[PDB]
Amino acid sequence: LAPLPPHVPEHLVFDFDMYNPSNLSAGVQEAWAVLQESNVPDLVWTRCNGGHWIATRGQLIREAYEDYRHFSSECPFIPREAGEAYDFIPTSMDPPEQRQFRALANQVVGMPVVDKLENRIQELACSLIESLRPQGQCNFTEDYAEPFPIRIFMLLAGLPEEDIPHLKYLTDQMTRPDGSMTFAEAKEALYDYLIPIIEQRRQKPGTDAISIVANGQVNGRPITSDEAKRMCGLLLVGGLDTVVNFLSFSMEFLAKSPEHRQELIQRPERIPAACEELLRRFSLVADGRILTSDYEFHGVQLKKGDQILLPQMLSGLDERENACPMHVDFSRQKVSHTTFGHGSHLCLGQHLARLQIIVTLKEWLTRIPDFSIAPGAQIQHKSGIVSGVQALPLVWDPATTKAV
Numbered sequence: 001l002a003p004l005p006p007h008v009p010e011h012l013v014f015d016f017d018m019y020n021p022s023n024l025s026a027g028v029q030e031a032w033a034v035l036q037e038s039n040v041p042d043l044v045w046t047r048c049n050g051g052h053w054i055a056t057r058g059q060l061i062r063e064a065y066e067d068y069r070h071f072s073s074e075c076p077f078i079p080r081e082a083g084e085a086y087d088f089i090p091t092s093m094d095p096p097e098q099r100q101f102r103a104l105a106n107q108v109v110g111m112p113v114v115d116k117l118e119n120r121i122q123e124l125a126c127s128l129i130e131s132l133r134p135q136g137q138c139n140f141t142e143d144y145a146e147p148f149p150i151r152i153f154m155l156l157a158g159l160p161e162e163d164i165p166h167l168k169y170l171t172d173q174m175t176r177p178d179g180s181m182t183f184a185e186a187k188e189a190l191y192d193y194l195i196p197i198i199e200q201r202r203q204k205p206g207t208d209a210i211s212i213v214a215n216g217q218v219n220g221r222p223i224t225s226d227e228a229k230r231m232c233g234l235l236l237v238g239g240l241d242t243v244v245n246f247l248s249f250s251m252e253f254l255a256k257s258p259e260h261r262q263e264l265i266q267r268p269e270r271i272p273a274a275c276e277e278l279l280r281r282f283s284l285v286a287d288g289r290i291l292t293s294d295y296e297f298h299g300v301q302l303k304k305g306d307q308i309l310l311p312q313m314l315s316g317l318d319e320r321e322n323a324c325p326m327h328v329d330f331s332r333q334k335v336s337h338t339t340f341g342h343g344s345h346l347c348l349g350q351h352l353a354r355l356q357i358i359v360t361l362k363e364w365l366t367r368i369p370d371f372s373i374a375p376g377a378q379i380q381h382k383s384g385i386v387s388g389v390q391a392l393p394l395v396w397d398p399a400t401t402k403a404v
């Protein structure tokens with residue numbers, strides 16, 4: 001625990017550890033939701049991970065993400081060393097500078113590319129699931145959650161699948177470090193991988209996402225090799241460690257709730273709405289901002305240089321935003337959340353993510369309508385910048401399945 005700074009009043013201290021929260025065994029979202037109990041202020045200080053603020057309510061989280069003048073993305077990760085090393089584009093930039101880079105990232109992960117890839121995405125989901133179907137069991141994280149998103153990303157980026165274990169290792173060190181590598185070491189190893197590839201593809205442009213970024217333009221001028229590398233690194237992290245984790249939360253929930261499976265089997269047209277409500281309930285990202293200047297925010301004195309975690313996960317779990325927030329209701333009238341962020345940094349990969357999620361729900365429930373958590377299994381979550389599921393053993397009776 002880091003010594004309490006003199007400017008932080010003792011009454012605002014709640015020593016929450018974002019990388020190993022105390023209530024983790026209850027589930028990761030539940031573990032974070034302790035910050036939303038009635039006795040906890042809207043804005044707390046934790047002495048964990050070097051000391052930082054945490055906004056605990058949707059109203060404050062949204063407000064801070066909108067106000068880039070006071071809350072800068074220049075240093076968006078905790079601990080400070082990670083945030084300081086963090087230089088991915090566009091995320092480490094504030095408007096006005098940030099904006100031009102979004103358009104280029106959209107050329108590779110935006111709606112047009114999602115439309116291009118939809119066939120291969122559907123094909124891979126169907127292929128993976130049909131292969132598992134007659135087995136009556138799987139290790140979901142290894143057998144589907146990882147390969148389905150990752151193999152599609154590797155295809156899009158024109159990278160060999162043999163590189164997956166290395167890259168997945170590095171990306172996991174930036175979000176849920178095991179202690180072997182600092183964020184800076186993992187980032188530099190990712191850049192080390194990308195540097196020769198970016199040079200190659202600037203010399204001989206191709207069709208893949210790295211080529212497109214590396215040869216792209218931003219507001220009418222050429223992207224630099226450095227800028228390309230900083231954007232490609234971010235795309236790799238997004239491709240390898242977002243949907244991969246979310247799919248497991250969703251499938252764990254469905255495995256534990258026959259009534260929700262029944263709902264989507266009976267009325268498959270509800271799947272997009274289900275996706276949205278699952279994105280709220282099993283929201284999984286938490287990054288933040290740095291104070292650009294001394295600022296009074298909701299009665300609290302923040303100091304220039306203070307880090308503030310603004311957990312995207314927390315907005316939709318806020319009872320003030322959503323009644324009975326821990327309850328999954330596919331018919332929820334107003335699904336309020338910031339799962340894909342808020343303000344000028346709104347997720348660029350969300351259209352890809354939604355497609356991958358919706359394709360998975362549709363194709364899984366078609367073939368394996370009934371399934372459960374393996375007898376006696378206790379599902380363990382993990383927490384970090386992006387939270388996840390350590391393992392998800394599923395079982396089903398093959399006699400309840402259908403080959404398409």
Ligand code: HEM
Pocket residue numbers: 073076089090091092098102105109234235236237238239242243246284285287288312338339340341342344345346347348349350352353
């Ligand atoms: C369930 C899946 C996903 C979730 C929950 C998610 C969440 C987020 C969040 C919360 C942010 C804002 C971060 C901030 O403001 O500091 C963000 C930004 C971003 N995401 Fe996603 N993401 C997902 C999938 C993806 C995928 C698959 C990609 C593909 C590479 C991607 C690419 C990006 C990029 C490039 C940004 C930066 C936009 C900017 O800074 O202007 N995301 N994402």
Ligand SMILES: CC1(C)[C@@H]2CC[C@@]1(C)C(=O)C2
Pocket residue numbers: 088091175234237238242285287385386
């Ligand atoms: C917080 C994020 C999900 C967003 C895309 C990948 C991620 C880890 C980032 O560094 C920005």
Ligand SMILES: [K+]
Pocket residue numbers: 074075076083084085086087092
């Ligand atoms: K930085």
